[PDB]
């Protein structure tokens, strides 16, 4: 049905935008951005540690 109609199901376009002084809803959305940014910055650390060695091996 997805291929026939030529329409992909929409994903969560939420984390990217958000807004300060929101409510209890944006309090969650804010706290989401922190944990994923810390996971992001940890996910970039173990890549850079090896760096280009892991890439050129593949």
């Amino acid at each position: 049905a997805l291929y026939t109609e030529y329409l992909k199901q929409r994903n969560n376009k939420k984390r990217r935008t958000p807004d300060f002084n929101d409510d209890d809803d944006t309090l969650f959305l804010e706290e989401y951005r922190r944990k994923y940014p810390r996971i992001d910055t940890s996910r970039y650390i173990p890549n850079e540690s090896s760096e280009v060695s892991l890439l050129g091996i593949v």
């Binding site: 300060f20 002084n21 929101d22 409510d23 209890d24 944006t26 309090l27 969650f28 804010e30 706290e31 951005r33 922190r34 940014p37 810390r38 992001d40 910055t41 970039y44 650390i45 890549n47 850079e48 760096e51 280009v52 890439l55 050129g56 593949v58």
Partner: protein, 84 residues
């Protein structure tokens, strides 16, 4: 024995009060957003430096790796016509 149980019971009561003060929250919201703005700043600046440092080294290796992938797609397509 009696002193050990009275401390274990009180510790469970304070643990329930700590889980109750956390469930209600999820003034205060402005501080968390600013804490993220520090993170967003600090982290994304690190990310952009880690990215651009990687990109400089790895966009070359991406092209190397990605132009090699295109060779499989032609090495396969010829393979079938020869088998056929």
């Amino acid at each position: 024995x009696x002193x050990x149980x009275x401390x274990x019971x009180x510790x469970x009561x304070x643990x329930x009060x700590x889980x109750x003060x956390x469930x209600x929250x999820x003034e205060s919201r402005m501080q968390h957003i600013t804490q993220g703005r520090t993170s967003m700043k600090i982290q994304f600046k690190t990310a952009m430096p880690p990215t651009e440092v990687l990109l400089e080294s790895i966009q070359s290796k991406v092209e190397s790796i990605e132009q090699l992938q295109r060779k499989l797609q032609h090495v396969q397509p010829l393979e079938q016509q020869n088998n056929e």
